[PDB]
């Protein structure tokens, strides 16, 4: 079980770890998060009590290095940093643990929620969407724009999600205009799956990462990417059975996890109505359709 120690908590802040969160008071003796499950990516995220615009976080995997958080009073945020000195780090963690100044990652043993949300998400794929090659962890915030949003302004601070555009040459083969526009199977299977993602696992990993960035940071471009990737599958007449069954599981856990109160901003009426009721795959997402109908019937 890995640990992300904090140097200190000089400013009052809501700290998130994956789907959990807790309030820390200005100069509270908080020295970090222990018992973090190995085997998955994690996201530690922040919302300053004095300024809710300040909403940001770090994707990391504790198998890749020893990471800690330290407040930077100049840039005015909690920064992730890597500790290179193994022995210094082990000794820091041991002290804070002995003094019980660490919150425990509060995983219920029955609870597969985080695994279910991150099943296909891999740090190496995150690091290609979020380019900052000197760090092993990835910074995301509420205001970072996607490469696609920037085409329609700082390239270095962008989310490099795969551009999906239903009305692009990429999506539409010359001479198959109506066929490719009405049945996106070519775009899904040849361009995206075989061509760009190489397999359904990478496609689902980006889909899951987009959802999580949408939910944890209210990142609008991430929400757009998550909906495009769902719509591209639901608008394809020809999808491998395993992908449809897996999509239903993926979406079910995403809808299950979404805060009830954020449904209005994070869910696109047109895409969900189309995907559940109109699309080729309208009868292929039983779990997702049941949770959406029971949780969010107004949207539909």
């Amino acid at each position: 079980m890995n640990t992300v120690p904090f140097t200190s908590a000089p400013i009052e802040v809501t700290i998130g770890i994956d789907q959990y969160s807790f309030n820390v008071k200005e100069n509270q003796p908080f020295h970090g998060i222990k018992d973090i499950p190995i085997g998955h990516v994690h996201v530690i995220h922040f919302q300053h009590a004095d300024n809710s615009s300040m909403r940001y976080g770090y994707w990391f995997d504790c198998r890749m290095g020893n990471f800690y958080i330290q407040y930077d009073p100049k840039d005015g945020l909690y920064k992730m940093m890597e500790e290179r000195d193994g022995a210094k780090f082990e000794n820091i963690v041991h002290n804070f643990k002995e003094r019980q100044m660490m919150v425990s990652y509060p995983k219920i043993d029955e609870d597969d929620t985080w695994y279910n949300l991150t099943e296909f998400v891999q740090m190496d794929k995150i690091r290609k969407i979020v380019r900052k090659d000197e760090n092993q962890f990835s910074y995301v915030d509420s205001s970072m724009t996607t490469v696609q949003e920037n085409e329609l302004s700082d390239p270095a601070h962008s989310l490099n999600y795969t551009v999906i555009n239903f009305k692009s040459r990429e999506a539409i083969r010359p001479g198959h205009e109506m066929e490719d526009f009405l049945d996106k199977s070519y775009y899904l299977n040849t361009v995206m799956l075989q061509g760009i993602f190489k397999n359904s696992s990478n496609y689902f990993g980006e889909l899951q990462f987009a959802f999580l960035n949408a939910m944890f940071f209210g990142n609008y471009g991430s929400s757009l990417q998550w909906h495009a990737m769902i719509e591209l599958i639901c608008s394809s007449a020809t999808v491998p059975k395993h992908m449809l069954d897996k999509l239903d599981e993926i979406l079910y856990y995403q809808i299950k996890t979404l805060p009830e109160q954020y449904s209005d901003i994070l869910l696109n009426e047109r895409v969900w109505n189309i995907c559940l009721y109109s699309s080729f795959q309208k009868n292929s997402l039983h779990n997702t359709e049941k949770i959406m109908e029971n949780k969010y019937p107004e949207l539909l």
Partner: protein, 254 residues
């Protein structure tokens, strides 16, 4: 964005544009079968592609063979329209290609956009104008060429005849829309008005009669009165009560 009353003069500027109307592409007669079911029989249709500035009409005849063994024909008709418009643009020299295509029906926007991805600088636009281009098939010579076609065929017309020798494209377009609006509301009466003097003939190379400027003013009057008469007969409204502000507004409104 959308073409409306506000930006109407833009039709007559020197940026090449085409209207595309797909109403007469997919045409059927509905009939009873022997077993008492209903069936359709397709007839020849046409794409109505018009340069509102020049009067140049690219009448692409849609032969019933297009539809053979195809499903969801009203949907296919949009995509076939978009294919034929894109093939027309591609066939034109670069300096004759339109900068804008205005579709008369919003269901044409996606089909045309997807067929024109090779032309990202051609703006595909809807219009808020209620244009009477469906009545194109009430112009005898246009109806005849469509009905006689035995294969796909493009036929080129000037829908303004020689009017641009005497009037502006603004006035030519208003005259054309008033004629088509009349033909659409009461074809019989509209045509009777256009032939009421057998001395004024239609030249072999024209669609409309050779009216003098004075006769055009009279004809335009009779067309407006017909649109008003029919609007009266439709809504059970006493038209002899109406004002000139009330009146103008129901050809406008229409």
């Amino acid at each position: 964005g959308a073409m409306n009353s506000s930006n109407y003069a833009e039709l007559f500027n020197n940026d090449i544009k085409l209207f595309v109307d797909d109403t007469n592409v997919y045409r059927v007669t509905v009939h009873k079968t022997f077993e008492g079911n209903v069936a359709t029989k397709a007839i020849n249709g046409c794409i109505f592609t018009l340069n509102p500035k020049t009067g140049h009409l690219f009448l692409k005849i849609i032969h019933t063979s297009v539809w053979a063994g195809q499903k969801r024909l009203s949907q296919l008709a949009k995509w076939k329209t978009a294919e034929e418009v894109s093939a027309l643009v591609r066939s034109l020299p670069k300096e004759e290609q339109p900068k804008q295509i205005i579709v008369t029906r919003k269901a044409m926007l996606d089909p045309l956009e997807v067929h024109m991805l090779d032309f990202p600088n051609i703006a595909i636009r809807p219009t808020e104008l209620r244009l009477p281009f469906s009545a194109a098939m009430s112009i005898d010579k246009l109806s005849d060429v469509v009905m006689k076609a035995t294969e796909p065929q493009m036929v080129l017309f000037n829908i303004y005849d020689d009017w641009l020798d005497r009037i502006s494209s603004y006035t030519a377009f208003s005259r054309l829309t008033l004629l088509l609006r009349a033909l659409k509301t009461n074809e019989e009466s509209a045509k009777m008005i256009l032939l009421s003097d057998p001395t004024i003939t239609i030249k072999s190379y024209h669609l409309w009669p050779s009216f003098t400027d004075e006769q055009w003013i009279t004809i335009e009057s009779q067309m407006r009165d017909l649109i008003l008469t029919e609007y009266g007969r439709k809504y059970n409204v006493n038209i002899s009560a109406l004002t000139q502000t009330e009146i103008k507004d129901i050809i406008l409104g229409q």
